[PDB]
Design an enzyme around this catalytic site. Sequence first.
Site, PDB file in Angstrom:
ATOM      1  N   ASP A   1       0.855  -1.188   0.000  1.00 53.83           N
ATOM      2  CA  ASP A   1       0.000   0.000   0.000  1.00 53.83           C
ATOM      3  C   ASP A   1       0.902   1.253   0.000  1.00 53.83           C
ATOM      4  O   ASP A   1       1.890   1.300   0.718  1.00 53.83           O
ATOM      5  CB  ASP A   1      -0.954  -0.087   1.198  1.00 53.83           C
TER       6      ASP A   1
ATOM      7  N   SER B   1       4.514  -6.244   2.186  1.00 48.61           N
ATOM      8  CA  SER B   1       3.322  -5.787   2.862  1.00 48.61           C
ATOM      9  C   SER B   1       2.056  -6.231   2.143  1.00 48.61           C
ATOM     10  O   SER B   1       1.917  -7.421   1.848  1.00 48.61           O
ATOM     11  CB  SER B   1       3.380  -4.293   2.962  1.00 48.61           C
ATOM     12  N   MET B   2       1.133  -5.315   1.823  1.00 48.44           N
ATOM     13  CA  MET B   2      -0.115  -5.699   1.131  1.00 48.44           C
ATOM     14  C   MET B   2       0.116  -6.395  -0.236  1.00 48.44           C
ATOM     15  O   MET B   2      -0.715  -7.126  -0.688  1.00 48.44           O
ATOM     16  CB  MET B   2      -1.008  -4.474   0.917  1.00 48.44           C
TER      17      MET B   2
ATOM     18  N   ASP C   1      -1.974  -2.687  18.124  1.00 50.59           N
ATOM     19  CA  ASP C   1      -2.807  -3.868  18.272  1.00 50.59           C
ATOM     20  C   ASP C   1      -4.281  -3.511  18.563  1.00 50.59           C
ATOM     21  O   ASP C   1      -5.182  -4.253  18.222  1.00 50.59           O
ATOM     22  CB  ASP C   1      -2.171  -4.706  19.357  1.00 50.59           C
TER      23      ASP C   1
ATOM     24  N   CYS D   1      -2.533   0.569  22.212  1.00 48.48           N
ATOM     25  CA  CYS D   1      -1.873  -0.593  22.787  1.00 48.48           C
ATOM     26  C   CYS D   1      -1.125  -1.359  21.737  1.00 48.48           C
ATOM     27  O   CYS D   1      -1.578  -1.549  20.630  1.00 48.48           O
ATOM     28  CB  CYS D   1      -2.796  -1.522  23.590  1.00 48.48           C
TER      29      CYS D   1
ATOM     30  N   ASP E   1       6.315  -5.941  13.246  1.00 51.88           N
ATOM     31  CA  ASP E   1       7.316  -5.135  12.582  1.00 51.88           C
ATOM     32  C   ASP E   1       6.994  -3.640  12.580  1.00 51.88           C
ATOM     33  O   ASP E   1       7.656  -2.869  11.879  1.00 51.88           O
ATOM     34  CB  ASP E   1       7.559  -5.644  11.176  1.00 51.88           C
TER      35      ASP E   1
ATOM     36  N   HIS F   1       9.059  -2.655   9.376  1.00 49.33           N
ATOM     37  CA  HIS F   1       8.290  -2.961   8.185  1.00 49.33           C
ATOM     38  C   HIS F   1       8.874  -2.455   6.879  1.00 49.33           C
ATOM     39  O   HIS F   1       8.950  -3.219   5.905  1.00 49.33           O
ATOM     40  CB  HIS F   1       6.899  -2.422   8.382  1.00 49.33           C
TER      41      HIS F   1
END
Length: 377
Positions: A11, A163-164, A305, A320, A325, A357
């Site tokens: 993305d 990634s995506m 998260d 949180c 990554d 990432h």
Amino acid sequence: RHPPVVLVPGDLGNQLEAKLDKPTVVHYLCSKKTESYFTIWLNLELLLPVIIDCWIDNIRLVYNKTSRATQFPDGVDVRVPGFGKTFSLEFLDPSKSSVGSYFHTMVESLVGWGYTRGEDVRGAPYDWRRAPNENGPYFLALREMIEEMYQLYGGPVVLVAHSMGNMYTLYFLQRQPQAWKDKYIRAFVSLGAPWGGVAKTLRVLASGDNNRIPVIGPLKIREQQRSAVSTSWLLPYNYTWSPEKVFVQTPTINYTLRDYRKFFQDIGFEDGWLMRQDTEGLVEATMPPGVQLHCLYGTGVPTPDSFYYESFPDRDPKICFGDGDGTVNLKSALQCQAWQSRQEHQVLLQELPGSEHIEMLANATTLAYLKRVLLGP
Ligand SMILES: *[C@@H]1O[C@H](CO)[C@@H](O)[C@H](O)[C@H]1NC(C)=O
Ligand SMILES: *[C@@H]1O[C@H](CO)[C@@H](O)[C@H](O)[C@H]1NC(C)=O
Ligand SMILES: *[C@@H]1O[C@H](CO)[C@@H](O)[C@H](O)[C@H]1NC(C)=O
Ligand SMILES: *[C@@H]1O[C@H](CO)[C@@H](O)[C@H](O)[C@H]1NC(C)=O
């Protein structure tokens, strides 16, 4: 000798160009017309205050509830430059500034190992604002490019996705016959794959993410982020996450992955629910790619998260963090392990501790692993 390589971005992971002939604009200082295409991503000057409204008006997708499909705003075309080449995924900003340096370090390495840009290493950029359901032509071009590379360079290709782009690649592979994959695909190197979605998508959709770039208001950029189908496509999936996990908590309501319809109502973005329905079934959760797979995942970076909102949806939440990554949650990345028993082709898992990432694409350890896949023992 060495196999041909196709690079699949994530993305935001390739340049986009726009050409305008608009009936109306949101500000007088916005251009109604351009004589040619200009770079709409990434050009930093378009993201400055006020001017960013022009950019949003051009780069947003319009959701049509009748067709259940996105379209561009009236008088706007957006095209993906550099298909079959590498420039548009090496540098997101055509100025070649380091701020947009994405696949450049990896391509430099490949070229140092004997690859040739546009020949035996090629990019497969796409309109990453859409999900696979609205990128049919891209998958046809990807299939054709793979076949061409096989014929030209005399062997099956290694797909390298970030990634995506991994989810795009899995979608593609799930829809090709096993015989085709056995002939044309040598391996799939999967870098930072969000196989079951990423939790941060909830925050993006609810309240925006300006990524710590304070000159962009999060509620302003939220307009663009919601408009991109790919954002709702990457909401957490129940094959990776418990259906009872709360991703978003507010003083009066929780949202789990079973609660997306309520979530979209409550944030005032009902189209997002429609986009989720359009896209949530595209990749079969449990079907393996059916090719040799190297799953590389970062750990040891705090990764959002879940989110606690005092004031929902127009204030930033408290965050949180879990493992991953920085973007892709460890759980998501690990869907890969389930595939080991479901295909004959090998599935190799490789942890990358401390690899963020985006940095993983320029990281010497990542590149050493890729070198081993390509150039052998
Ligand atoms: C939505 O698409 C349908 C055709 O699929 C058509 O009725 C209508 O023109 C579209 N709406 C807009 C605003 O373009
Ligand atoms: C949401 O979940 C938490 C437990 O995860 C709970 O403490 C709280 O009461 C819940 N909120 C609502 C509004 O039901
Ligand atoms: C899991 O996911 C899909 C929606 O993405 C849904 O249709 C399916 O029934 C869910 N199953 C559960 C929670 O058992
Ligand atoms: C590169 O990735 C390795 C392998 O995970 C990690 O240990 C190291 O931190 C990384 N280097 C940089 C500069 O991030």
